[PDB]
Write a protein that binds this ligand. Sequence first.
Ligand SMILES: *[C@@H]1O[C@H](CO)[C@@H](O[C@@H]2O[C@H](CO)[C@@H](O)[C@H](O)[C@H]2NC(C)=O)[C@H](O)[C@H]1NC(C)=O
Ligand SMILES: *[C@@H]1O[C@H](CO)[C@@H](O[C@@H]2O[C@H](CO)[C@@H](O)[C@H](O)[C@H]2NC(C)=O)[C@H](O)[C@H]1NC(C)=O
Ligand SMILES: *[C@@H]1O[C@H](CO)[C@@H](O[C@@H]2O[C@H](CO)[C@@H](O)[C@H](O)[C@H]2NC(C)=O)[C@H](O)[C@H]1NC(C)=O
Ligand SMILES: *[C@@H]1O[C@H](CO)[C@@H](O[C@@H]2O[C@H](CO)[C@@H](O)[C@H](O)[C@H]2NC(C)=O)[C@H](O)[C@H]1NC(C)=O
Ligand SMILES: *[C@@H]1O[C@H](CO)[C@@H](O)[C@H](O)[C@H]1NC(C)=O
Ligand SMILES: *[C@@H]1O[C@H](CO)[C@@H](O)[C@H](O)[C@H]1NC(C)=O
Ligand SMILES: *[C@@H]1O[C@H](CO)[C@@H](O)[C@H](O)[C@H]1NC(C)=O
Lengths: 228, 316, 73
Amino acid sequence: QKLIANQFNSAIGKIQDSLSSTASALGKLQDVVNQNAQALNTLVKQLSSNFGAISSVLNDILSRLDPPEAEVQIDRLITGRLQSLQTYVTQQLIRAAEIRASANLAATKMSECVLGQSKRVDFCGKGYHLMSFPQSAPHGVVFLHVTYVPAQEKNFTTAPAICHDGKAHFPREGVFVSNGTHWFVTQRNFYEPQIITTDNTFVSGNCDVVIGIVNNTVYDPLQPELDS
Amino acid sequence: ILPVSMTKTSVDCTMYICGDSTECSNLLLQYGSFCTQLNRALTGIAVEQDKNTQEVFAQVKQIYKTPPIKDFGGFNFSQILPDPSKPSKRSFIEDLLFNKVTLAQKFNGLTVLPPLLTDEMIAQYTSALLAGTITSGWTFGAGAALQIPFAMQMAYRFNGIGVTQNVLYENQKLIANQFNSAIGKIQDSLSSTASALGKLQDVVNQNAQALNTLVKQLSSNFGAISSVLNDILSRLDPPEAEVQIDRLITGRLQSLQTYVTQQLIRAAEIRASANLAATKMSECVLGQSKRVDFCGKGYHLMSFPQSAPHGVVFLH
Amino acid sequence: NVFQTRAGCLIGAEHVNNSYECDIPIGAGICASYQTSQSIIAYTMSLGAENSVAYSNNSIAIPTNFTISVTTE
Ligand SMILES: *[C@@H]1O[C@H](CO)[C@@H](O[C@@H]2O[C@H](CO)[C@@H](O)[C@H](O)[C@H]2NC(C)=O)[C@H](O)[C@H]1NC(C)=O
Ligand SMILES: *[C@@H]1O[C@H](CO)[C@@H](O[C@@H]2O[C@H](CO)[C@@H](O)[C@H](O)[C@H]2NC(C)=O)[C@H](O)[C@H]1NC(C)=O
Ligand SMILES: *[C@@H]1O[C@H](CO)[C@@H](O[C@@H]2O[C@H](CO)[C@@H](O)[C@H](O)[C@H]2NC(C)=O)[C@H](O)[C@H]1NC(C)=O
Ligand SMILES: *[C@@H]1O[C@H](CO)[C@@H](O[C@@H]2O[C@H](CO)[C@@H](O)[C@H](O)[C@H]2NC(C)=O)[C@H](O)[C@H]1NC(C)=O
Ligand SMILES: *[C@@H]1O[C@H](CO)[C@@H](O)[C@H](O)[C@H]1NC(C)=O
Ligand SMILES: *[C@@H]1O[C@H](CO)[C@@H](O)[C@H](O)[C@H]1NC(C)=O
Ligand SMILES: *[C@@H]1O[C@H](CO)[C@@H](O)[C@H](O)[C@H]1NC(C)=O
């Protein structure tokens, strides 16, 4: 317990320092703001364009030209500005669709990784998922996935099954491993050797069919008790 | 089969509308900043296209490789593993997929850019993923790869789908033969039939049709005397020549607008498909899935990725 | 200095027979980066470090320790 608590505290401190030092981690949130600002700036700047008319301001045109062709110039400006606004609105629609598509995924992640534990591989962070903590952000959300990662490996010599009295014994939950001389049964995600006995193994027929079977003694927790 | 990326295209604005005409460019400058929005949108599309492949395939920290001795408990993976004899390190089924797809020529200001990753890199990525899946199971998706005999891995999967491992260990030859026969059957089906890859051919056909229509739009009078800028300039008095040129400029600009909008929508659809492909690669391949009908009909055991032109192919 | 690639041609950068991670993408598998000399180099990107698990029909690798990690998304 103490080692895991210390590791979690150190990880939290490390991510806090990483956020405090580097400023390029929030590119996803900054891109939306920059794109919207550029779109609005372009739409505003599109006003000062002749579009084929004499001047870019209709007040000057009205104060200098008589109606019959001043209206033609105004109509040209109307067409240009209307089509520019059309383009801006279409771009906004597409971007909003993309943002909604991202928000749905954010909602799904909040529902699954936070409110429960997820078995979907590589969905709530690399490694085996344990929990998550949500954090708010300007026009966004930030998750802190907590994951479990195996660290230090070893080498052993497995076996699909084991013969004891001509029968075949398979592991109930785990694998058979050998440290060179003896045989053990251990869970598949953490080395914890145990003696092979009739509580970890279940019998299934004779043992002349399995390929790779190697026989060794299997302990029985009842005979020594019955001896007394 | 599902697509992952589209053609990396880009079209110049000034050259398309006013190709080699100073007067046309001078007239176009009056319209403001309409020659940069299209370029920005196409640049964004190109970057998105690169990112789609980069995120779908590049999911391995290292590049694993299978041991020289192919002793996999009776299973036969020679039809999907890389073939060193071929000049390109691509498998038999990858070659079949490459030969089943057929079909820059225009030069009116349109260019195509090569993808960031060559097909050899994609083949190497899929080879690394497949070798990791064969040798280490799903342990290479979490941390470092851990070796494990293939029969024991299959027993683990059988236990995963709620079937006791003694079912597999006492029938191993039967499953081996069935898997080999299935691989042979799918190879024969790919070799014989030709309409299986429609989901990849239709994207290319749509892009080609869009580009062809955009090019063919050049020959529209749009209400002017002629569709040639030089012909109008060399025949008409400039004060009305510019008036005539305005119609052509407007028509070509709006055609470019329409093409860019269509490209944006198609790119969004392709991005959605690429995200789905990335999710499938992360779940079905790097692990075992309990989601019904996600990794194929029936109870899922494992999957193998295979590359394809502008797409990926799974063998559930 | 003139260099020719499949995505056009690059001038001002020198060719290198090595391979590193991609820093500034160019195209067709060519990535450019700033060495250290203090020059600009254009190489061919490397996907990753070569590895080969010691697979065998009676060999296993079981972890004996773990580590807790926190990832920000
Ligand atoms: C494999 O594990 C067994 C069980 O722990 C080891 O057998 C014991 O070894 C210790 C010394 O390491 C002795 O003090 C014990 O008396 C041994 N047990 C018995 C029942 O005699 C064995 O040595 C290990 N093998 C290797 C190569 O480390
Ligand atoms: C399991 O133990 C038995 C002994 O009971 C071994 O069987 C012997 O195998 C040899 C060679 O195959 C024969 O010459 C003997 O006649 C067998 N003995 C009996 C009683 O049948 C068997 O080899 C052991 N398992 C393994 C994998 O070695
Ligand atoms: C795996 O299957 C392939 C089939 O593609 C086998 O390759 C064939 O092997 C037979 C011998 O049984 C030869 O007659 C054929 O010419 C081979 N075909 C090709 C295309 O080379 C391969 O032998 C099988 N694996 C093993 C270990 O036998
Ligand atoms: C498992 O790994 C942890 C660290 O990942 C080990 O804990 C360290 O042990 C050393 C002792 O040599 C201490 O100096 C460190 O301070 C410990 N780290 C932490 C974070 O507490 C642990 O010892 C390993 N397990 C075994 C059995 O060795
Ligand atoms: C297991 O042995 C192989 C070769 O015998 C070696 O390459 C590998 O590193 C060993 N495993 C560990 C965890 O050291
Ligand atoms: C494992 O492979 C070796 C050859 O490297 C072979 O001699 C041995 O019989 C194999 N083991 C089994 C259980 O098939
Ligand atoms: C190293 O690069 C040079 C060009 O910079 C090239 O001529 C030479 O062939 C390369 N070396 C090898 C072994 O290919």
